[PDB]
Amino acid sequence: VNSFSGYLKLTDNVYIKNADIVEEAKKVKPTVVVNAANVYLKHGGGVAGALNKATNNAMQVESDDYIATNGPLKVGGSCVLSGHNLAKHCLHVVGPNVNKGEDIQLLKSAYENFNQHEVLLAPLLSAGIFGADPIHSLRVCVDTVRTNVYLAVFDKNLYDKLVSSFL
Ligand SMILES: O=C(Nc1cccc2c1[nH]c1ncnc(NN3CCCC3=O)c12)NC1CC1
Ligand SMILES: [Cl-]
């Protein structure tokens, strides 16, 4: 039993809710919140901009030190950093950005990072400003992640479409 509330169960291990991931994280304080990161951990907009804003820019300060030490992430890769006031940990995961021409095939590799964590609160990778089809992202999530994932979808119309079209 965990404290995630109001989710629709899609499969044995995938759950979904129309919710603002920032408000979900603040309420639940999950062990792991996933950020929709880019390779430079520049948290300017989308989910990343919202999560970072909620940390009063502490996420960005920590991220800049991480990049200065380690260099950029790979598309499809991840790193574990602090969850600040939102979670114990933040798993920064880089899905491909279609608006940069990045290979959508890397979306499966991106979701594989979730399997290193027993339970996660997460957005749909490569959705939103990353330009992929959220229906495809949900399918890859279900077919790749084996650990327990609680998906927060900000847009109500999109959420209803994701549920109604789910196979
Ligand atoms: O500004 C925010 N939040 C916020 C800002 C921008 C985007 C999101 C967001 N929260 C989200 N939660 C889940 N997914 C998101 N984005 N995507 C990615 C793929 C489908 C989708 O809808 C966002 N919060 C402040 C008011 C307290
Ligand atoms: Cl977005």
The domain ranges of the chain are: 8-163
**Experimental technique of record:** X-ray
76 in contact with ligand 1, CB cutoff 6 A: no
Strands 8-9 and 78-82: unpaired
Tally Cβ neighbours within 10 Å of residue 28: 19
Give the burial class of 5: count Cβ atoms within 10 A of its Cβ; 0-12 exposed, 13-18 middle, 19 or more buried: exposed
Say if ligand 1 is within 6 A of residue 41 CB: no
Per-residue burial over 113-143, b if 16 or more Cβ lie within 10 Å, else e, is bbeebeebbbbbbbbbebbbebeebbbbbbe
Other Cβ atoms within 10 Å of 65 Cβ, number: 12
Atom of ligand 1 nearest to the CA of 137: 19
Sheet of 148-153, strand order: 8-9, 14-18, 148-153, 119-122, 32-37, 89-94, 78-82
**Helix, strand or coil, per DSSP, at residue 14:** strand
Q: What is the resolution of this structure in A?
A: 1.0
Q: Which residues contact 131 (CB under 8 A, 6 or more apart)?
A: 97, 98, 99
Strands 89-94 and 32-37: parallel
Residue written as tokens 């798993």?
Answer: 91
Structure tokens at 161: 């479409």
Cβ count near 50 (within 10 Å): 18
- Give the closest residue to 17 by CA, choosing from 7, 26, 2: 7
CA of 37 to the centre of ligand 2 (A): 11
Which amino acid does the sequence have at 21?
Answer: I
Amino acid letter, residue 123: P
For tokens 């499809």, what's the residue?
76
> What are the residues facing 17 on neighbouring strands?
152
- Of 15, 17, 18, 20, the residue with max ligand 1 atoms within 8 A of its CB, to mutate for a pocket test, comes to 20
The CATH number of domain 8-163, selected from 3.10.20.90, 3.40.50.1220, 2.40.40.20, 3.40.220.10: 3.40.220.10
